[PDB]
Amino acid sequence: PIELPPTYITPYPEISAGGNGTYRGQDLSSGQSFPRGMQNPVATVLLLQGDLYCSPNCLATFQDQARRDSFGIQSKVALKTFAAADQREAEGRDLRTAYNEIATDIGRSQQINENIIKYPPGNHVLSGGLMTPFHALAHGMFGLGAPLTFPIQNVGLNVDIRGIPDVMNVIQSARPVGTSSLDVNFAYDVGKDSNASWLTLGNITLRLVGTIDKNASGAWTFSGEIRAFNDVYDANPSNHRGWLGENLTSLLSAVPFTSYSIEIPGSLPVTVSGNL
Ligand SMILES: [Ca+2]
Numbered sequence: 001p002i003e004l005p006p007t008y009i010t011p012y013p014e015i016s017a018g019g020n021g022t023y024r025g026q027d028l029s030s031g032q033s034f035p036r037g038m039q040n041p042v043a044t045v046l047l048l049q050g051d052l053y054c055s056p057n058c059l060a061t062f063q064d065q066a067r068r069d070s071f072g073i074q075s076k077v078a079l080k081t082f083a084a085a086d087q088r089e090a091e092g093r094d095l096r097t098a099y100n101e102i103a104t105d106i107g108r109s110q111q112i113n114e115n116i117i118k119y120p121p122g123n124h125v126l127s128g129g130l131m132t133p134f135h136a137l138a139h140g141m142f143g144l145g146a147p148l149t150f151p152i153q154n155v156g157l158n159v160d161i162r163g164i165p166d167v168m169n170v171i172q173s174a175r176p177v178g179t180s181s182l183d184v185n186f187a188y189d190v191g192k193d194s195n196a197s198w199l200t201l202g203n204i205t206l207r208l209v210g211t212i213d214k215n216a217s218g219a220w221t222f223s224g225e226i227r228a229f230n231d232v233y234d235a236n237p238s239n240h241r242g243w244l245g246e247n248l249t250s251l252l253s254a255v256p257f258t259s260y261s262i263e264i265p266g267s268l269p270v271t272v273s274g275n276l
Helices: 041-053 058-069 073-090 095-107 132-142 165-171 195-201 237-244 246-253
Strands: 181-189 203-215 219-229 231-233 260-263 268-274
Touching: 041 058, 041 073, 041 095, 058 073, 058 246, 073 095, 073 132, 132 195, 132 231, 132 237, 132 260, 165 181, 181 219, 195 231, 237 246
Parallel strands: none
Antiparallel strands: 181 203, 203 219, 219 268, 231 260
């Protein structure tokens, strides 16, 4: 979730409210390639697959598409569609609606090539939902190296301080009956809490900052925040092997890619007690 600053600046400017030029690209010659009333069949396909791609069958369906055209035009356009959709989800839009709106616009495109949907590499933001992994994947191929943002609130963390023993170690260490600082960082397998987001981030480093306070003897309340250090998406497709499969990994290994920075801003407040 996380609202998003009032003045965030979408990467897919709305152009004319509703989809009209929003997604989809400049042309060449000549406005032909199939009759003029007809919807671009690449879009038709996307619309036929919307029930599947916007659900937990997404991966399976995509794998099948990749295999059928060898990561060709249909497959690329679908993948760029997932990013735009996932982005829109990050800006607060319902995913399936965004998806349709996107596909309908591609549908107005009169060419049949892999760039009939724009992938503007600017300001991308991962949503944390169903298509985030594909957005990050998208980005590694179409993003020309640009860093992008995956707000800490969208990762699905759910950090129990009490069972990270390095942290607790530090907490239990002589102190007054009041203040005392704690600022410690530590590795964390986003997989403890979310396997989707693990697909995109793997391990990250988190950081804990706050104080702790002691009562009667006694226990202690730490209240403070968690924050995250920027992670680096290694876009070499052999790192997605286990997730994407033999066929797709192989096809993707032909395609150029560039790793990029993922910034993870924000606070996750935390409060805890414990003892001895
Ligand atoms: Ca990582």
